[model samples]
Target chain A: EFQVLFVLTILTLISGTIFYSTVEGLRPIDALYFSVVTLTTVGDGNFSPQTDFGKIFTILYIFIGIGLVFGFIHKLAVNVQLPSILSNLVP
Target chain B: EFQVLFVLTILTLISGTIFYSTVEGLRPIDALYFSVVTLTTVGDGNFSPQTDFGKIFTILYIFIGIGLVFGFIHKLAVNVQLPSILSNLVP
Candidate 1:
């Protein structure tokens, strides 16, 4: 479960990087910041995707980010109810 | 509780469709896709409403969607603790 959680987080971050660089035309730092902002849905409108392709990608990115967030929350809830789910069997 | 959940889900979907068709000028499928994107707050910048009216409507739609999702989760949590709530009182 812990490994799954970590992998999901990493994948989400990586996806955000691709989204920012390509869609927002942002530098790595700015893209990272934009990704976090959009993922949180706190769209300040400081920067927005203006291209047709960017917009299309934006739509996809938002859905994926939302899924990740809900998935994380759901997993956290399950972990709370079953603490043993976090225990590593390999150890 | 089940009835309430069903009603809320329907209402949310209907309102979302209206917002999509009127604001986004999308076909039913596109509207549905766009609605899900926004409601989930995935916000992939594709097919955003460009008019002033659309922007205002977008703001309202987002808040409503957020409310519905959080409300659903809260209801689920409550139902888990009190399964009796799922039964029809009339029966």
Candidate 2:
């Protein structure tokens, strides 16, 4: 059910950590921390952007990534409740 | 359109902060920080729960709250692209 979401999330997580590790000059763990923090609405500022390249990527990542995430989770949630909705409709 | 989502999110944010503040004995800022972190699926460990009540609430909050947030954002994202989706359906 979360196939698309799960796949895309993994892709995003991988790409984000790799790109961030290179651009932000952080270790794998720190890059990972920043990536997930950025993905969520919670801006803990654990790792902030200090470089031009980093800022640009961060901007685009937030804009595009957040919507895709929301859509996927919505799909998953709807899928989970589909049976209940279907029953309501049928009955 | 996102009114339901917005209102519910606000309510959750308020109640979460108050409950966490009392139970965790944290300051307002810390409580706010923990609430947002928990709600967004981030789990930053900025503020961890150490009590029986805390863990139980965390479990339920994650299960229920994340879905509401995803659904709301999904509604917002779809609203933003409604014209595009509508055109495809219409034609």
Candidate 3:
């Protein structure tokens, strides 16, 4: 479960950074900021996409972002349900 | 459970369509499309509100959309916990 979380986090960050840079023309820091804002669905609107490609990308990102969140939640539920398996293997 | 889902879906669609048309000046179909996109958080940005009222409406819509989703999930959880109620009645 931890491994899955770690992998998902890394993938999310990497995809988010790339997507932001591609769509928003933001530097790494600004891209990270925009990605975080959009992922959280905060819509601060400090920055917005100006091009058609960027808008399309935003649509795709939102879809994927929601899936990732639900995936994380599902993982948490599974981990909680299997706590007994971990206890049995613990020294 | 089905009734709850049906009612929520209708309410979401109607409220969303009304909000979009009022804020975006979209025709009924466009308004419906915009509402679906925003409610899903897909945010295609093909059509968005250009007015202050629209922006405020969008914010409210987002809040309500999230609430509706969570409410549906909560209802599902309750239904799952009490499936015997339906099962016995059907049998």
Candidate 4:
């Protein structure tokens, strides 16, 4: 479950970044940043979809992207165990 | 678990909308729309946080709001069992 969500999240970010960069004409970093911002919902309005098609694409992307991003985050809490400093010292 | 996330998601959207409407000076419906968009990660940019304080508040809102909204959604899929449409024909 962890690996599945992890891979899907990675793929979603990568594909969305590629689409935004090539179609929206944003720089690579900017594209990736936009994808992350869009998925995370921290859209501070620093960037926006310009083209008509890009806007349409973003609507779809948001549905898929937000699910994968948040799903992975949710699963992370359930699956990943962090060592407590106190427990580490005792053991 | 469902009820907890449901209430929290409701609370987050309601409080966030009220904050945006009163603080940001957006119309009530617009404030609600903005809150939903922000939490859902759609963020089409029709409206944005203008004031310094509002932007700061929104940064925090996203962290809480998205988690509740998405968590509720994730829980919905897991806990809610829908009756199969095809099976209804005979039984």
Reported per model, the fraction of native interface contacts reproduced equals 0.15, 0.13, 0.00, 0.24
- lDDT per residue for candidate 1 within A25-85, as digits (tens), equals 7888887777667666665355666555665566566644554555556776676545665
Which candidate has the highest TM-score of all? 4
Residue-level lDDT of model 2, residues B1-91, one tens digit each, is: 3775677778877888897889988887788778777777666544555565765576456545677766667877787568577877894
Candidate 3, what DockQ? 0.08
Show where candidate 1 strays beyond 4 Å. Answer: A70-91, B1-38, B41-64, B67-91
Task: Give the CAPRI rating of model 4.
Answer: incorrect
Superposed by TM-score, candidate 1 places the C-alpha of residue A37 at a distance from the truth, in angstroms, of 1.8
Please tell me which model should have the higher DockQ, number 1 or number 2: 2
> What is the iRMSD in Å for candidate 2?
6.5
lDDT of 1 by residue, B3-86 (tens): 686488558867777877876686655666556556755455546787788889878878767777556545543454224423
For model 4, residues B28-53, the per-residue Cα lDDT tens digits are: 66676667777786674667798998
List, residue by residue over B1-91, the lDDT tens digit for candidate 3.
Answer: 6468748866887887787776677665566656655676545434568898888988888887866754554454345522543354463
Spell out the clash pairs found in candidate 2. Answer: none
Report the Cα RMSD per candidate. Answer: 10.6, 8.9, 9.6, 7.9
Number of residue pairs clashing in candidate 3, backbone atoms closer than 3 angstroms, sequence gap of 3 or more or interchain: 0
Task: Report lDDT (CA) for all predictions.
Answer: 0.63, 0.69, 0.63, 0.73
Worst 10 residues of 4 chain A by lDDT: A78-87
TM-score of each: 0.49, 0.51, 0.49, 0.53
Can you give the lDDT of residue A44 in candidate 3? Answer: 40
Candidate ranking (lDDT, best to worst) = 4, 2, 1, 3
Off by over 4 Å in 4: A81-91, B1-36, B39-46, B49-91
